[PDB]
Design a protein around this ligand. Structure first.
Ligand code: CA
Ligand code: CA
Ligand code: CL
Ligand code: CL
Ligand code: ZN
Ligand code: ZN
Length: 224
């Protein structure tokens, strides 16, 4: 495959400057690593602090550039379970304000900084300083009320996190915290935000085409 293992973590290169990190609780969860010139940016923690430290040490070994910041895509264990490891390593952390507000209730450690969003879903840019190619979009409530998404400018890649399921999926997975009414529109809004992205990365399946977006929305239509 060309995948690399480091400890409990698996890494897959998606583009010259983009890798997928995969950690396991065994249920896989995926996030991203982005090389932006002389620094690295992370999207999502692993499930645990130990696994998240393994991400950081793989970065040091294989890329050897400082990790400037991390953005985490909602307040659940697969995305924010490793916040203490990021803070211990001195990595500035960012999440939706609503994720930070929900974090204690969800058993997560809040990020240091809060992202806020316009009515059209786009991040208010002063809340996302020096984000380089990361384009942060809040598509509306779906998998959770706080779920956010990230496009990588200059690439074909957009990250749907746990909102988006793969195009062969039989269900929308864990709907315990979901907004079943608004989910379909939120999935479609993600697609519209990143209209040229052709590789859709998501939390619990391998990267897919845009078919994942329209399939997710079709399944979500049946919840309303
Ligand atoms: Ca912890
Ligand atoms: Ca919950
Ligand atoms: Cl790239
Ligand atoms: Cl796009
Ligand atoms: Zn979740
Ligand atoms: Zn998830």
């Amino acid at each position: 495959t060309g995948d690399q293992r480091f400890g409990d973590l698996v890494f897959r290169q998606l583009a010259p400057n983009v890798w997928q990190h995969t950690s396991y609780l065994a249920v896989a969860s995926n996030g991203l690593i982005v090389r932006d010139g002389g620094r690295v940016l992370v999207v999502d923690t692993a499930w645990t602090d130990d696994q998240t430290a393994q991400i950081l040490n793989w970065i040091k070994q294989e890329i050897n550039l400082p990790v400037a910041l991390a953005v985490v895509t909602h307040a659940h264990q697969d995305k924010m379970g490793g916040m203490d490891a990021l803070h211990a390593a001195g990595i500035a952390t960012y999440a939706n304000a609503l994720s930070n507000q929900l974090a204690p209730q969800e058993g997560m450690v809040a990020a240091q900084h809060s992202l806020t969003f316009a009515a059209n879903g786009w991040v208010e840019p002063a809340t996302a300083p020096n984000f380089g190619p990361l384009k942060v979009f809040y598509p509306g409530p779906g998998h959770t009320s706080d779920n956010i998404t990230v496009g990588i400018d200059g690439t074909d890649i957009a990250f749907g996190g746990c909102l988006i399921k793969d195009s062969k999926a039989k269900s929308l997975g864990n709907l315990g915290d979901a907004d079943t009414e608004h989910y379909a529109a939120s999935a479609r809004a993600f697609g519209a935000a990143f209209p040229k992205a052709s590789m859709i990365v998501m939390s619990h399946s391998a990267p897919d085409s845009r078919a994942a977006i329209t399939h997710t929305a079709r399944m979500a239509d049946k919840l309303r």
